[PDB]
Design an enzyme around this catalytic site. Structure first.
Site, PDB file in Angstrom:
ATOM      1  N   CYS B 484      38.747  -1.602  56.049  1.00  0.00           N
ATOM      2  CA  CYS B 484      38.919  -2.141  54.710  1.00  0.00           C
ATOM      3  C   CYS B 484      38.531  -3.614  54.761  1.00  0.00           C
ATOM      4  O   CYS B 484      39.304  -4.451  55.214  1.00  0.00           O
ATOM      5  CB  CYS B 484      40.392  -1.984  54.315  1.00  0.00           C
ATOM      6  SG  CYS B 484      40.783  -2.050  52.553  1.00  0.00           S
ATOM      7  N   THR B 485      37.332  -3.935  54.305  1.00  0.00           N
ATOM      8  CA  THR B 485      36.870  -5.324  54.333  1.00  0.00           C
ATOM      9  C   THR B 485      36.945  -5.953  52.948  1.00  0.00           C
ATOM     10  O   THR B 485      37.207  -7.132  52.800  1.00  0.00           O
ATOM     11  CB  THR B 485      35.435  -5.391  54.832  1.00  0.00           C
ATOM     12  OG1 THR B 485      35.440  -5.237  56.254  1.00  0.00           O
ATOM     13  CG2 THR B 485      34.778  -6.716  54.438  1.00  0.00           C
TER      14      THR B 485
END
Ligand SMILES: [Zn+2]
Ligand SMILES: [Zn+2]
Ligand SMILES: [Zn+2]
Ligand SMILES: [Zn+2]
Lengths: 572, 572
Positions: B484-485
């Site tokens: 999850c960036t």
């Protein structure tokens, strides 16, 4: 039983994105030969004519037809001036083409078929104007043709179908004295009386308009032949046989062929390929999706539009101002206005995350805006070189400073959220009141060597209601909002992000009977300390005698204005 | 009582920074006339000769002498090739000058005085090579001069002092038949026998070497005059009277005049003005002071050098990587190495604070380094395009990947602190072990839509000792380090600053009997949550069966190496 043979458009243009890309690649590096390979077998029960597919290779020499395909030569005329394109004799143009076909046809009846494309390309806007034209000549214009059906000859039809599949460069064929399909030959047809045409139409009982071309060449070659047999050969089951006779109604050559546009009229077609080829637009697309995608998989109830359309005015383009504008930008915000009087100094780039060594000595506020536009060209970033007058300070050049006071309002007004990112208490006053008098949410960020303070203005207290730091306080604590800009670098980063994340939780709808939203709490004040890595959320009530949001104060400014602001500034 | 008249250098050069600035301004936009205004009254009891002040105006036409000043004409010869300057016949040069003075002197005894400057300017390094020369000719070289004191004539001296103050263009004067000071005149002196010289020396009983010039012209004019009176007039009290006689010892003209350098030898002088005129150096100066000044007024016990000299290797040049490198830079860090395999995508600039729209599609890691160098040119920033292999993944192209494994060590080795800023758990393994096997502090930053995790590797547990998030956990919580960036932008900003501020508190000396330093605590793990604006500091012990820092694991890699790393990577 009889009737007048009516026609249908010979082709349908299908210009692929690649075609327009090649067209451009050529305009940067005025007639052009095009070649297409037709496929008279692959025809959707939904279309009326053979589709003419144009791509980045129709421009090429070596195209590679597949078995059964019919190569068709054509050309494109490109115009650089949009006016010239618009102001072209469409009619004289198609006529000048039809003539070229007529000249080839009288030589080889199988070379009077072709297409043309006129076009003007707007490379900067990625718009493309074009018009496909299929020269269809009828000479003489008076000579029409009476026709009556003949029941099918599946045998004859199959014969011609095969012949045309093989003889891929021929559009016409006939029968010899032994009734065998052979190339058109004036003195032969003149006796055999049968003409078979490779039709490009699917319109029931209505042949391609190209039929007119061949009949015009036929009339020229056999002036006397007046009764013959026409065979419209289609690659499926619509092939039909016709009993023909050449009538006359009153050398004149009528020409038709221009293709009808998407809407249905006889005009140019315009295709805007910017949302596909504009790197700037393709970019903006993704910046959008990152959020869209974020919302969709993790928080579908999040409101992005609200955040996106919030016009943010940042008072101060220093360490805070840059980290803040940065965070806003990643949240979708597109309107950001920087207000800073100073210029970029040598010691700024390593600290204030928006400048470079090269832009030192240059006007700071205007450079921050330019900086954002380099990150994202579509940003509506602006910089205003304005100075906020401080409390307890002898007024200097009251005129110019009065303007500065007026300009500061026009800004606090045209904007929704106001970020107060100044250095000392002294520069927070004027903007804090004006913002209150104008009903605008205000978020304060203050730095301290060790800590920081983030808070919002409304009832809820403001920055001047109660003091933030006490005197009987820590040394490294009393440095808060004390003109202390140099601090442990991490302070500003944190102060900024929390300020922006508080603004978004706050911009969401609050759950009835609770002080939270889909993004979480919405504190009044946030306080972080680096030495112990902690945070505190305190809330304070509007104080009756606050020198900024107190009823008496608001009244004063309301009734007197500048006169009061002025006195308030000098009062020590 | 008698003696041979000895001399002292006529002048002393004082070249001001402005002089060298003008010299440059002229080299970008080969002889040059210079004018200086001498002040024979203003003479420090510490100097031996009249100071010759050169500034940005000695180059000018209109200089403006003050009452009593003596204008002195001169010139500068600039050389573009450093070799030519070095390889110049210093002797022939001064001789070619002395001759020019001799030619003027025999015409007007008061025009044989002047100075010259040879110089080579290295504009890029801001170095300046120069040599001041005062043509002092003695002809004939054999003719020396015997002299014996005469008791003072304060009356006569005062007379000459006034005359020279007025007659500012004259260096010599004499007495007429009525004993009145008048301009030198061969047939007059030839009888009056008195010569008064405006001396530029303070050396007791030792006149300026320029005396030789005048005596050479005197001999030329009055060959027979062999006994006369010399008066060395100084603007103070050293003026002295001399009984002179012209001796001879064995036309030959000896020339002297070159000035001795700072060290005391007869060579060129070299001045390096970079620390003053190099905008790059002036910049670096301030970046330093901001910290120096910060320490000095708020935390004098803070160690800056330690932080400055820490070589930081950042694994990942994404959102975290940019915000992290940014914070380090503001803390003084000068060695930063970026390691990222990807390229800059369209959706990156608005999020990853180091890129622009213009640099999309370009190699990411190498661009981050270039980006830092634009902020601060002196940074030692570097970018390596390397990919870290992930756990539970079929090995692909084992050779090239083996190299990638080797290169990743050479990096984790030449660096002091290792920042693990990757996306998922899978890419934290190989680097986390290697860092452990190589004894390097490791700080982890992990992102989660709502939260973040920052922690350090040692006993203290590591990232793989115990799991960070549990399964029976919040939806928006389990997103941590889950590839999850894209998250609420504020997460990365906070995660980054805390990671860098933890690294600095940690880099300071710990107070004996406590887990703090001058900068505060030094937590093991930090955890922040945005929905409620909170932080938690947890600590965890090294776990015996950790698949990364466990004794058995370390052993494995130690004994087998790649063979083990490889198997460990593919093991699902
Ligand atoms: Zn024939
Ligand atoms: Zn208040
Ligand atoms: Zn004379
Ligand atoms: Zn472990």
């Amino acid at each position: 039983s009889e009737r007048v043979l009516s026609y249908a458009p010979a082709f349908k243009s299908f210009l692929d994105t690649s075609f327009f890309q090649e067209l451009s690649r050529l305009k940067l590096d005025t007639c052009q030969p095009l070649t297409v390979n037709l496929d008279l077998h692959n025809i959707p029960k939904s279309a009326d004519q053979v589709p003419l597919f144009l791509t980045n290779r129709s421009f090429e020499k070596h195209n590679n037809k597949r078995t059964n395909e019919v190569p068709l030569q054509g050309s494109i005329f490109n115009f650089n001036v949009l006016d010239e394109f618009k102001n072209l004799d469409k009619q004289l143009f198609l006529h000048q083409r039809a003539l070229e076909c007529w000249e080839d046809g009288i030589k080889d009846i199988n070379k009077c078929v072709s297409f043309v494309i006129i076009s003007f390309a707007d490379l900067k806007k990625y718009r493309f104007y074009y018009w496909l034209g299929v020269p269809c000549f009828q000479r003489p214009s008076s000579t029409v043709l009476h026709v009556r059906p003949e029941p099918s000859l599946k045998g004859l039809f199959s014969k011609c179908q095969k012949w045309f599949d093989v003889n891929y460069s021929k559009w016409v064929c006939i029968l010899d004295a032994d009734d065998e399909i052979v190339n058109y030959d004036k003195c032969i047809i003149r006796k055999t009386k049968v003409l078979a045409i490779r039709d490009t139409s699917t319109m029931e009982n209505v042949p391609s308009a190209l039929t007119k071309n061949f009949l015009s060449v036929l009339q020229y070659d056999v002036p006397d032949l007046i009764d013959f047999k026409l065979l419209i050969i289609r690659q499926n089951e619509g092939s039909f046989a016709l009993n023909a006779t050449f009538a006359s109604i009153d050398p004149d050559m009528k020409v038709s062929g221009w293709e009808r546009n998407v809407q249905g009229k006889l005009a140019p077609r315009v295709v805007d390929l910017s949302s596909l080829l504009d790197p700037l637009k393709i970019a903006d697309q993704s910046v959008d999706l990152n959020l869209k995608l974020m919302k969709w998989r993790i928080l579908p109830d999040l409101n992005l539009d609200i955040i996106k359309n919030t016009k943010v005015l940042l008072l101060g383009a220093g360490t805070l101002g840059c980290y803040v504008s940065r965070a806003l930008i990643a949240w979708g915000v597109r309107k950001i206005t920087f207000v800073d009087n100073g210029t970029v100094s040598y010691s700024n780039p390593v600290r204030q995350a928006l400048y470079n060594f090269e832009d030192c000595g240059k006007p700071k506020a205007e450079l921050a805006a330019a900086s954002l536009k380099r990150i994202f060209p579509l940003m509506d970033a602006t910089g205003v070189k304005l100075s906020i007058p401080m409390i307890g300070h002898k007024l200097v050049n009251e005129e110019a400073q009065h303007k500065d006071f007026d300009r500061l309002r026009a800004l606090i007004k045209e904007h929704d959220i106001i970020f107060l990112l100044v250095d000392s208490r002294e520069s927070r006053w004027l903007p804090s009141l004006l913002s209150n008098i104008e009903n605008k949410t205000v978020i304060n960020a203050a730095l301290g060597f060790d800590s920081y303070l983030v808070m919002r203005h409304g009832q809820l207290g403001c920055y001047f209601c109660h003091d933030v730091v006490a005197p009987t306080d820590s040394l490294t604590d009393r440095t808060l909002d004390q003109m202390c800009t140099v601090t442990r670098p991490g302070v500003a980063m944190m102060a900024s992000s929390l300020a922006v994340e508080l603004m978004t939780s706050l911009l969401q709808t609050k759950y009835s009977g609770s002080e939270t939203t889909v993004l979480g709490d919405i504190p009044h004040q946030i306080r972080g300390f680096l030495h112990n890595f902690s945070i505190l959320k305190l809330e304070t009530p509007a104080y009756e005698h606050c020198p900024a949001c107190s009823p008496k104060v608001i009244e004063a400014f309301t009734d007197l204005g500048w006169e009061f602001v002025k006195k308030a500034l000098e009062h020590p």
